[PDB]
Design a protein around this nucleic acid. Structure first.
Ligand SMILES: [Zn+2]
Ligand SMILES: [Zn+2]
Ligand SMILES: [Zn+2]
Ligand SMILES: [Zn+2]
Lengths: 76, 72
DNA sequence: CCAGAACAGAGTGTTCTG
DNA sequence: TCAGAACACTCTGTTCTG
């Protein structure tokens, strides 16, 4: 049965930083947590984040990472 | 003075028919030539400003067209 | 199996030129 | 005048490595 990234709904590769995610959201989260952490949404902070649109809004992608429970300590 | 009609950034001059910055100038050219299928993650109403213009090419491109940008 | 590094490509914006 | 080239920099996602 299918394993689904809890952030962008792409096929998940495994449990990364505590949450079932794809490889691209894994490394996106690590980069967001180590980066400028100044993200702006051009929308309403509800942007659709899927395989097609996840590049559009780093702010909403990162919000969904946090909301899903991702953390660098990789606590479940 | 001198404001980009697309993203509100300081405008360099009149490009492809409209007063725009350089980033919007080259973005528009790249978009017209460049095949792309742009899709808004929003409502097709995105805020386009100096930082936010990067987020939504679809809305940036739409504003470009609606402002009258033309390859001549 | 998973974190992190490394690699390569896409996207963006500036500088320079005539 | 502004269009184009091209350089330089950021963001992304897959493949490697430990
Ligand atoms: Zn994902
Ligand atoms: Zn958003
Ligand atoms: Zn602009
Ligand atoms: Zn949009």
């Amino acid at each position: 049965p299918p394993k689904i990234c809890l952030v962008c709904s792409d096929e998940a590769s495994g449990c990364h930083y505590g949450v079932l995610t794809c490889g691209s959201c894994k490394v996106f989260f690590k980069r967001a947590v180590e980066g400028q952490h100044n993200y702006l949404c051009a929308g309403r902070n509800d942007c659709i984040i899927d395989k097609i649109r996840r590049k559009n809004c780093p702010a909403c992608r990162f919000r969904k990472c946090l909301q899903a429970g991702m953390n660098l300590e990789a606590r479940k």
